[PDB]
Amino acid sequence: GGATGRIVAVIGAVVDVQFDEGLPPILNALEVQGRETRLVLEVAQHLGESTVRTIAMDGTEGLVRGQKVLDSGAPIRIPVGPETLGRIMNVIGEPIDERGPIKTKQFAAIHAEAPEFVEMSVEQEILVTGIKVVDLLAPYAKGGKIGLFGGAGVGKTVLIMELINNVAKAHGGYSVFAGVGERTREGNDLYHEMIESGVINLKDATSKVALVYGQMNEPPGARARVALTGLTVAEYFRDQEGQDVLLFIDNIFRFTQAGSEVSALLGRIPSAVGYQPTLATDMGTMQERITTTKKGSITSVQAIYVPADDLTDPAPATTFAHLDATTVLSRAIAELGIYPAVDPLDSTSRIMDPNIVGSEHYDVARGVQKILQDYKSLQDIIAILGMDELSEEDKLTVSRARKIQRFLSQPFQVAEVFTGHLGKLVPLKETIKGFQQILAGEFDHLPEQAFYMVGPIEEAVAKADKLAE
Amino acid sequence: ATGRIVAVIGAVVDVQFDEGLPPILNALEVQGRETRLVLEVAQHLGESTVRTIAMDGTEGLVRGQKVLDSGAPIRIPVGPETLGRIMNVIGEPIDERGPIKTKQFAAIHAEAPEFVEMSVEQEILVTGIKVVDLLAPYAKGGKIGLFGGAGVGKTVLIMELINNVAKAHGGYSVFAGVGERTREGNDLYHEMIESGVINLKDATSKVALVYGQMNEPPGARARVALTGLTVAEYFRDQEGQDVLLFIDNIFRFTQAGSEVSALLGRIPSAVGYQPTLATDMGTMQERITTTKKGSITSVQAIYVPADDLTDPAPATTFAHLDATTVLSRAIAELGIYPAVDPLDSTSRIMDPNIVGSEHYDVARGVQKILQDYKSLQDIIAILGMDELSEEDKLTVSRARKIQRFLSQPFQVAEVFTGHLGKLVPLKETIKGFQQILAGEFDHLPEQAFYMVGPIEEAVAKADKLAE
Amino acid sequence: ATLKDITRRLKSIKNIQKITKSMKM
Amino acid sequence: FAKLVRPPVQIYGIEGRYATALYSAASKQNKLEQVEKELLRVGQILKEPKMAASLMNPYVKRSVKVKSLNDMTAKEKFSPLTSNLINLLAENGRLNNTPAVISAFSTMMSVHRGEVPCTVTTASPLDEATLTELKTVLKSFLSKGQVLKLEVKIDPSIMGGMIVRIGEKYVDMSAKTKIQKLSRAMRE
Amino acid sequence: TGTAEVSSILEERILGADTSVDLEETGRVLSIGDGIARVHGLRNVQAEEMVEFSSGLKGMSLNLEPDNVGVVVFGNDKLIKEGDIVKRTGAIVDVPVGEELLGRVVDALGNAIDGKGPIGSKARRRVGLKAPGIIPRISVREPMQTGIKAVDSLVPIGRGQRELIIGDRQTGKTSIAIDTIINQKRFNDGTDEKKKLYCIYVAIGQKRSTVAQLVKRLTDADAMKYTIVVSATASDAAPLQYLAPYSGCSMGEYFRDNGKHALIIYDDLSKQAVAYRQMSLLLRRPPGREAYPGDVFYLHSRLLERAAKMNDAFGGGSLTALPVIETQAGDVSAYIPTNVISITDGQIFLETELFYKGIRPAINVGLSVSRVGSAAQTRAMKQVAGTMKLELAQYREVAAFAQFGSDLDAATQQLLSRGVRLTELLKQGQYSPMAIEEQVAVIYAGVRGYLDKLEPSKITKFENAFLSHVISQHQTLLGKIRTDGKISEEADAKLKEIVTNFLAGFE
Amino acid sequence: VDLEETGRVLSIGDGIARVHGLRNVQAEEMVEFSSGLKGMSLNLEPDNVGVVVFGNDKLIKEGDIVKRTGAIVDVPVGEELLGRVVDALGNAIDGKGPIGSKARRRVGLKAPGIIPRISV
Ligand SMILES: Nc1ncnc2c1ncn2[C@@H]1O[C@H](COP(=O)(O)OP(=O)(O)O)[C@@H](O)[C@H]1O
Ligand SMILES: Nc1ncnc2c1ncn2[C@@H]1O[C@H](COP(=O)(O)OP(=O)(O)O)[C@@H](O)[C@H]1O
Ligand SMILES: [Mg+2]
């Protein structure tokens, strides 16, 4: 099986290897020797005289024309078990936390089919994360593809820190982080914060998050397939562990960037805006592998970059097509000053139905969305003449909607250094009561800054008493 | 000759001829099919290889499959035996009433008329509609275009154009539906049958139909205008007649040519179109010009994309256009059927050197008095001086009477509404609008002009209303 | 300019035009 | 596919592809020098002005080209390797490329003999004792079991001389490049 | 530079004449790309023809470029290797159709995916047949009822036509499809063969868990007698998502050739265009605009113009196509929305500011129009919806003047008030389609104007209480409306009486 | 016959006739097709000459014999073209008889230098 071949042409990832004795099928792993490290190749197309066109994951500074590769029968196999929890591995399967090897028994192959239609689960139960704008305007699903979009500087990483904290500590099962082209210091702060919070235990096997981290400066074969490594680890924690597992993939747009870079170099015609033609198919495979099945329950929060706040880029549009409950993280509401600058007027939910969550929660959510959507056209009425001629009731609903929009902001516990405020936790019933109490007309007299950075409605009462007297 | 299919991509199949070879723009009968599979040769690359746009569903074609070569570019059945008949761009009848038993065939992919086969006289083509022949009149050899839609009376105006030109002049017509929807084409066929333009009973019909449907490949849709133009060129060049090519859509013609040139591997042009856009529109839109013998005239329904005028398909279209009569719903909800807007219909022939000083004087008076009525209608709607002057009330009464008078009862609407359809010649439109603008009929109510043909019948309608 | 910028600008001025007709009436 | 027999020098391009196919076939059936001498005879044939004028011209109707080359093969009784080779080059129409595939397969067979294409520039017309001792030390210098085929060229521009390229290895004691090395040394 | 000129087939060609692989029925796999094999051989294959790969796979073959057959793989490309043996099947790909496909979720080659047993099909229809012409079809003669009041009043569907649901992502647009399906339960419960119905939901490139949610919603609304669900999800291959709408449309073509009526809902047909662009750009077909190649309009037209009512000689069968298009931030001027809007016979347009403004379902009209949408109505709904459409046409001009409507005159104030009452009548809860009789009653009440005095937030509560009152007490009046097909002066007088009395006893 | 001064159309496609041989041709030269047509030999390549035609491609087959004229692209010229509709190549298309031109002005010479010019 271990058939040897010859590197004959080298451009980045895109490396042509000539086999004449044993030809590996597509999506495989070739071990290039001659390097002081190992080099791995993801085999793709076979062009002739048998030629695999592989994508090379480490930097190809120094590959000789005519080198010897070894061929194994692996799509790519990684160490996977309960041993790989407190340890950071990268896409080839190897630890980059400098703690020796990973001593496991069984491995796992990175490439598999999305399971079957008959194994798709059907239950939908609400997940409450403690965030206000999540809990009433786009609630999450235990067993659903949660996605949070945003540009650059809108607050996706601080939001994913708050979800990791506030959910991975409120979880008896396991966790899997996947840093897919995330910058190295933010993942380093993640690893040190995980150690100091205790979800990673460096002394024994009492950890419950498994970290797979491919840096943002790796060749595109190592920056596309590292998301699939996170999928494989979290599938094993869902397939035959028998455990509720959650996977945090930050930031699946490096996946599509990596695919567009190799498709520039592989010899495929550029599609629409400049990405690969196989965008929807490749991301359909790697987003339909990650879903809850009848064997186990897996919930996937995905931090998903959009380029310069352009939601009509085809890769965020197809990513919208794959989710269950998205959350837009705009920038304009942070130019206002609300953090994270969350758009719920562009956010979705499969979970938000009057039988699933309730009628009270649904009606206060649609009331908040109705009064914030009306505030836009009413604000454009304001923008020419001012607050003079609207009406009694029109100025009243403008001030009420502005008060709600200031009440959507919530101090994160992980972001007590950006604003200085300590940060609070808000249950679901308190969010329902607070927004129903602002819509009910109780707080028409308090100023807009009394509701700005608060938790419950009692915190808004206390801040109004502090500002007044 | 006998060649062989060697590769197949849809409407792009290429034939390898080993012997005598058809020139560019020619026809090929692919054999072995249950139907005919006609192909159009162009590109000789080698081993006599010709890239033929393939005109139907090319499922079932095998490598090395024998192709008979017929010579001629495309032969269609033309004649007076084609009227009331629906055909498609092969020349094949698709109304299922037997073949088109005619004597003379004719080749589509013909050329333009020569410079000596031209008419240097811009004769005003008179339809017979008052608003058309007074505010945007037609031209023998015109390339005119109507801007309609769904709710407006486009089909009624089309059948009224056919009947008025067949009665007044001696001309028959052809309707090329380019990218014609099969539902809409079937409804237009039943509409012509129940109106009487097409007669399935005897030889008195007035239009020949060429329907190139959307379900056909774009090779078989960029030839629909060419096929209907070939039938109308038979009427031009062997009777010397006053013919009307009604093309229902120039944008689907341009889109079909764009998709042909996209399938043939050509680097596309600007906004998404083909390089050959102006050249293809030149070939067709200059075959529809007048000659010394006949007067083919296109009326063509035109679609502008993104409500844009600077798009290249309307750029070339308006480079060839002459009248651009607008149809709309605003004056249709004012009761006038159909709302041919004149204020947005800028005809090129409206010029006193061409149509005459009396005609142009009356047309300027009508257009100016309706523009002034639109301004004073805005002012009387906001109520600033509330009836501004006696001159304001006078021009409001005059132009309200004129807007009621622009209506005409149509003969195609006679079968279900008792308002009998009148033909109004040019001289009577001139006399009627001149006597309305001259203040002669100021003492009549405005209702006495709604749906009346000439002006003396508006007098008689005012008399019969005074009861 | 870009395309979304001119879309934003046209949205803003269409709204200002409708509101200014409202103030006129 | 079938196991394509590896040629010693990968000549690339179209003509190298035809030549690797022909080499793998002739090494399966083990008649390599026979096919080489037959391709040399073909390359002698197709430089005749009548045959090459008939072949390079289009509108001689490719079937007639295939018939003419099959009749020329059946007249001079080629082996069944180069017969199907000339028929394949005629069917694909790359009879323009047949002296280049003859050159490429001749190169592959000359490496199969073991020759090394040695280049030497003495930069002056050298004598026979120098050439004898140079061929002696160079034949000792190259490898075991391989035979050299050397060529010498001259030019008065490069002073001194004795550049020797043997099998991609390029030893260079030319006086001009010695002054160039001292030139990079002196400018600093 | 040739594609088939490689040293393997050249070497086996000139070392000796093979005549052994037979080169016509079989064929060896040459360069296999990301999803497309370019196989050598298959001299007797035809175009668009389904071959099988020796792994056990299938794959349909297009481009043939004089030495090579462009077979696109119907599956994962991990297990197809260079040199494998292909085999012809002998026919262009068929879809197993029949009345045994009903209530079972299948997959685009016609094979069962929900695991509840195989399909008991008796005949296989050739996929991608030509559409019926002009004379065999006739126009919309039956009213296709969505159950959505906004659609069935303003933009009604006709049994016999195609109506393109268009909007942004998560703006109704599939809820209208599920309401269109669940509405046909009451017409599939009883008699009248020319009323009973077969829905076909062709999901193209969705998530597979949302197809599971769709089929659970249809099962617990008992919507599996009418329905077939054809599913080609995002995990499936590009050509299997390409071939999904033609498979369901062939099933519907079976249903309309045999007398019966059918509709089809192409959910994410833009994703079918995306899959065709993927497979064509990997076939190196020349890209047209936005990288979509030339025949994309020809693709969607050959798909969508198979829907028409048939004349009484050819049964009475009709098809109703409902394609679904996601637009990218209202960009109706893109490639695929302009193509399919030029194809389809109506559009149901959903601009999303109405959705977040709080009028759900999100059909925000004015751009939305049905080109035959007056003759495709019952005469009750024709009368009430005609007057209601004219009232809303007078309303929608003056809404920017209604934000300052307090200090204007009274004629406007009355018109804008009536429009507000009608516009909040048109909203409707999700997954609860109304029958024609009760929506005729409700929109009748709004048109006759027994609502102009009520508060705006009390219109929907009146609507629900009026449905409860009319269903509970006056069954015979809805029987009059659904059996006569119209209001004929006695339903009019009785509705005057009952709406005056219920407005007298509401609060 | 002779590939020096005549040549054969290898592949006339969209607007280009790639003609074989034609060795004595020179760049930008009016070379005439035996379909009665004209063209101008643009880009010379070692295998073929790219002549762009001066009419439709419908009149030109493959292997139609192409013949050099011997001079660069010209147009007939003079005061004998006054009063008259001509084609772009110089043929009178007004139908009232042929032209009486004696001179022959080249279609593509350069503009004058800055010295023979004088200002308006
Ligand atoms: N709850 C919050 N309070 C204050 N600032 C916040 C909050 N959430 C996010 N931010 C801001 O977001 C920024 C971090 O952005 P980051 O999430 O790294 O970018 P991206 O969203 O592209 O990942 C910081 O400047 C921080 O001030
Ligand atoms: N009352 C309602 N009426 C109409 N649509 C609704 C209603 N409530 C929710 N919806 C939305 O309809 C959507 C149907 O899905 P769809 O828009 O096709 O998803 P996608 O975003 O992939 O297009 C759901 O996402 C849901 O949010
Ligand atoms: Mg959807």
Tab-separated table of C-alpha atoms in Angstrom, chain A residues 34-259:
chain	number	residue	atom	x	y	z
A	34	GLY	CA	13.653	14.562	2.612
A	35	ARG	CA	12.391	17.365	4.846
A	36	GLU	CA	13.652	17.523	8.419
A	37	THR	CA	9.985	17.709	9.376
A	38	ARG	CA	7.277	15.649	7.743
A	39	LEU	CA	5.437	17.032	4.760
A	40	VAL	CA	1.899	15.897	4.019
A	41	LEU	CA	0.045	16.153	0.721
A	42	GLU	CA	-3.693	16.002	0.156
A	43	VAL	CA	-3.980	14.030	-3.084
A	44	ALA	CA	-6.401	15.350	-5.672
A	45	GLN	CA	-6.627	14.880	-9.473
A	46	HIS	CA	-4.706	12.208	-11.395
A	47	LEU	CA	-4.039	14.024	-14.659
A	48	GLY	CA	-2.119	11.305	-16.517
A	49	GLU	CA	1.123	9.313	-16.612
A	50	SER	CA	-0.304	8.776	-13.401
A	51	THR	CA	-0.262	12.268	-11.871
A	52	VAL	CA	-1.750	13.303	-8.602
A	53	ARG	CA	-2.094	17.032	-8.151
A	54	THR	CA	-1.679	17.382	-4.427
A	55	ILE	CA	-1.970	20.344	-2.112
A	56	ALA	CA	0.934	20.768	0.292
A	57	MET	CA	0.163	22.008	3.833
A	58	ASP	CA	3.553	23.101	5.089
A	59	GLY	CA	5.701	25.650	3.304
A	60	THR	CA	7.377	24.220	0.222
A	61	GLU	CA	10.586	26.195	0.537
A	62	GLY	CA	13.044	23.556	-0.600
A	63	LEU	CA	11.397	20.735	-2.536
A	64	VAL	CA	13.580	19.146	-5.203
A	65	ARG	CA	12.136	18.076	-8.555
A	66	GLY	CA	12.245	14.315	-8.327
A	67	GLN	CA	11.714	13.667	-4.659
A	68	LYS	CA	10.433	10.461	-3.096
A	69	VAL	CA	7.005	10.552	-1.474
A	70	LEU	CA	5.370	7.678	0.365
A	71	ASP	CA	1.751	6.737	-0.254
A	72	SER	CA	-0.520	5.525	2.521
A	73	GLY	CA	-4.188	4.662	2.212
A	74	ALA	CA	-5.348	7.491	4.451
A	75	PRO	CA	-7.565	10.442	3.494
A	76	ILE	CA	-5.744	11.874	6.402
A	77	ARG	CA	-5.598	10.045	9.745
A	78	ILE	CA	-5.297	11.831	13.092
A	79	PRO	CA	-5.002	10.733	16.737
A	80	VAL	CA	-8.470	10.938	18.261
A	81	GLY	CA	-9.707	9.884	21.694
A	82	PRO	CA	-10.149	11.055	25.268
A	83	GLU	CA	-6.383	11.604	25.378
A	84	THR	CA	-6.494	14.448	22.841
A	85	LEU	CA	-8.532	16.747	25.119
A	86	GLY	CA	-6.192	19.189	26.821
A	87	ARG	CA	-3.791	19.333	23.879
A	88	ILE	CA	-3.543	21.490	20.751
A	89	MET	CA	-3.073	19.532	17.532
A	90	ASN	CA	-2.814	20.654	13.936
A	91	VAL	CA	-4.350	19.249	10.784
A	92	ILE	CA	-1.739	16.555	10.075
A	93	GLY	CA	-2.488	15.184	13.527
A	94	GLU	CA	0.451	16.410	15.422
A	95	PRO	CA	0.691	18.296	18.731
A	96	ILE	CA	1.921	21.871	18.621
A	97	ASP	CA	1.674	22.435	22.371
A	98	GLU	CA	5.202	21.025	23.036
A	99	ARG	CA	3.991	18.318	25.443
A	100	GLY	CA	5.365	15.200	23.777
A	101	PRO	CA	3.337	12.888	21.550
A	102	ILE	CA	-0.358	12.080	21.852
A	103	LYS	CA	-0.635	8.519	23.173
A	104	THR	CA	-3.918	7.213	21.767
A	105	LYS	CA	-5.138	3.788	20.650
A	106	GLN	CA	-7.514	4.399	17.734
A	107	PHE	CA	-7.161	6.995	14.991
A	108	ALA	CA	-9.730	8.659	12.784
A	109	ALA	CA	-9.814	9.459	9.085
A	110	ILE	CA	-10.452	13.002	7.890
A	111	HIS	CA	-12.801	12.476	5.135
A	112	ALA	CA	-16.261	10.968	5.571
A	113	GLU	CA	-19.748	11.286	4.167
A	114	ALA	CA	-22.509	13.268	5.773
A	115	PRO	CA	-24.344	10.403	7.456
A	116	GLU	CA	-27.798	9.674	5.917
A	117	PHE	CA	-31.245	11.241	5.858
A	118	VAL	CA	-32.637	8.539	8.157
A	119	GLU	CA	-30.198	9.473	10.940
A	120	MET	CA	-31.083	13.181	11.032
A	121	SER	CA	-32.481	14.227	14.392
A	122	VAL	CA	-35.710	16.176	14.557
A	123	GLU	CA	-35.888	17.602	18.073
A	124	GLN	CA	-35.430	21.337	18.648
A	125	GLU	CA	-34.811	22.547	22.202
A	126	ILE	CA	-33.816	26.116	23.002
A	127	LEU	CA	-30.307	26.909	24.222
A	128	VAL	CA	-30.010	29.951	26.492
A	129	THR	CA	-26.525	31.448	26.656
A	130	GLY	CA	-27.163	34.379	29.003
A	131	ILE	CA	-26.772	37.044	26.317
A	132	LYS	CA	-29.803	39.326	26.000
A	133	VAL	CA	-29.974	39.860	22.221
A	134	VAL	CA	-29.318	36.160	21.722
A	135	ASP	CA	-31.870	34.958	24.265
A	136	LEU	CA	-34.826	36.915	22.974
A	137	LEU	CA	-34.051	37.917	19.385
A	138	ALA	CA	-32.167	34.886	18.022
A	139	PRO	CA	-32.178	31.992	20.523
A	140	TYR	CA	-29.860	29.094	20.132
A	141	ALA	CA	-30.523	25.397	19.642
A	142	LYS	CA	-29.004	22.471	21.507
A	143	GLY	CA	-28.281	20.508	18.363
A	144	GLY	CA	-28.214	23.211	15.730
A	145	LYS	CA	-25.719	25.006	13.512
A	146	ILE	CA	-25.342	28.365	15.241
A	147	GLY	CA	-23.556	30.945	13.126
A	148	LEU	CA	-22.479	34.471	13.962
A	149	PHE	CA	-21.417	36.627	11.038
A	150	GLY	CA	-19.491	39.861	11.045
A	151	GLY	CA	-16.872	41.961	9.350
A	152	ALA	CA	-13.544	42.884	10.933
A	153	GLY	CA	-13.665	44.633	14.283
A	154	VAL	CA	-17.338	44.008	14.991
A	155	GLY	CA	-16.893	41.683	17.962
A	156	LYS	CA	-17.029	38.061	16.789
A	157	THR	CA	-14.000	36.958	18.796
A	158	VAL	CA	-15.198	38.599	22.011
A	159	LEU	CA	-18.614	37.027	21.412
A	160	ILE	CA	-17.056	33.612	20.851
A	161	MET	CA	-15.055	34.107	24.067
A	162	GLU	CA	-18.302	34.855	25.904
A	163	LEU	CA	-19.963	31.770	24.421
A	164	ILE	CA	-16.924	29.583	25.242
A	165	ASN	CA	-16.904	30.857	28.848
A	166	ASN	CA	-20.639	31.004	29.515
A	167	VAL	CA	-21.505	27.728	27.707
A	168	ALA	CA	-18.432	25.483	27.871
A	169	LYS	CA	-18.423	26.006	31.626
A	170	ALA	CA	-22.180	25.281	31.689
A	171	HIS	CA	-21.745	21.909	30.001
A	172	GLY	CA	-21.098	18.530	31.584
A	173	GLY	CA	-19.975	16.938	28.320
A	174	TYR	CA	-17.081	17.826	26.024
A	175	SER	CA	-16.082	20.755	23.849
A	176	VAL	CA	-14.044	21.085	20.653
A	177	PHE	CA	-12.520	24.358	19.537
A	178	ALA	CA	-11.405	24.734	15.924
A	179	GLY	CA	-9.253	27.744	15.128
A	180	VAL	CA	-9.352	27.724	11.343
A	181	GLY	CA	-7.042	30.513	10.295
A	182	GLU	CA	-7.441	32.540	13.468
A	183	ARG	CA	-4.585	34.838	14.414
A	184	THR	CA	-2.128	33.319	16.811
A	185	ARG	CA	-2.332	35.693	19.773
A	186	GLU	CA	-6.127	35.446	20.082
A	187	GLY	CA	-5.873	31.653	20.095
A	188	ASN	CA	-2.992	31.949	22.551
A	189	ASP	CA	-5.134	34.054	24.876
A	190	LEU	CA	-7.809	31.398	24.413
A	191	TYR	CA	-5.407	28.628	25.469
A	192	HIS	CA	-4.066	30.537	28.477
A	193	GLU	CA	-7.567	31.621	29.542
A	194	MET	CA	-8.719	28.010	29.239
A	195	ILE	CA	-5.819	26.844	31.424
A	196	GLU	CA	-6.414	29.546	34.021
A	197	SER	CA	-10.182	28.986	34.074
A	198	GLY	CA	-9.645	25.258	34.482
A	199	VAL	CA	-11.393	23.799	31.456
A	200	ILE	CA	-7.932	22.570	30.410
A	201	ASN	CA	-6.171	20.710	33.219
A	202	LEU	CA	-2.430	20.312	32.654
A	203	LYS	CA	-2.007	17.815	35.517
A	204	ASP	CA	-4.408	14.955	34.721
A	205	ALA	CA	-7.265	13.915	32.416
A	206	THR	CA	-9.943	16.236	33.843
A	207	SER	CA	-10.210	18.430	30.748
A	208	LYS	CA	-13.318	18.875	28.637
A	209	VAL	CA	-12.254	20.939	25.609
A	210	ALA	CA	-10.200	19.588	22.701
A	211	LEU	CA	-8.370	22.218	20.693
A	212	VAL	CA	-7.528	21.958	17.001
A	213	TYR	CA	-5.705	25.047	15.815
A	214	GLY	CA	-4.331	25.814	12.366
A	215	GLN	CA	-2.633	29.206	12.192
A	216	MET	CA	-3.535	31.865	9.659
A	217	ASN	CA	-0.077	31.739	8.006
A	218	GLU	CA	-0.151	28.192	6.749
A	219	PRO	CA	-0.495	27.054	3.120
A	220	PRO	CA	-4.114	26.611	2.007
A	221	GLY	CA	-4.158	22.831	2.343
A	222	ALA	CA	-3.451	23.326	6.043
A	223	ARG	CA	-5.961	26.146	6.409
A	224	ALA	CA	-8.873	24.462	4.639
A	225	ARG	CA	-8.560	20.973	6.097
A	226	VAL	CA	-8.086	22.056	9.738
A	227	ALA	CA	-11.827	22.751	10.000
A	228	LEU	CA	-12.311	19.160	8.882
A	229	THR	CA	-9.947	18.056	11.674
A	230	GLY	CA	-12.162	19.814	14.202
A	231	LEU	CA	-15.146	18.106	12.576
A	232	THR	CA	-13.495	14.697	12.883
A	233	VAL	CA	-12.630	15.115	16.575
A	234	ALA	CA	-16.097	16.398	17.411
A	235	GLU	CA	-17.653	13.593	15.366
A	236	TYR	CA	-15.842	11.017	17.481
A	237	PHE	CA	-17.101	12.765	20.586
A	238	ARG	CA	-20.587	12.410	19.051
A	239	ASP	CA	-20.485	9.127	17.087
A	240	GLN	CA	-19.340	6.512	19.587
A	241	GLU	CA	-18.600	8.412	22.773
A	242	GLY	CA	-22.321	8.961	23.314
A	243	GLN	CA	-22.064	12.502	24.624
A	244	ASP	CA	-23.582	15.931	24.032
A	245	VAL	CA	-20.671	17.747	22.384
A	246	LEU	CA	-20.297	21.308	21.142
A	247	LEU	CA	-17.859	22.553	18.533
A	248	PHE	CA	-16.734	26.166	18.143
A	249	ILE	CA	-15.381	26.699	14.638
A	250	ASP	CA	-13.907	30.164	14.456
A	251	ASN	CA	-13.727	31.466	11.560
A	252	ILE	CA	-14.970	29.646	8.457
A	253	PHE	CA	-14.008	32.067	5.771
A	254	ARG	CA	-10.361	31.013	5.750
A	255	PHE	CA	-11.768	27.717	4.456
A	256	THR	CA	-13.211	29.453	1.407
A	257	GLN	CA	-10.132	31.674	1.011
A	258	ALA	CA	-7.945	28.551	1.067
A	259	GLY	CA	-10.154	26.876	-1.518
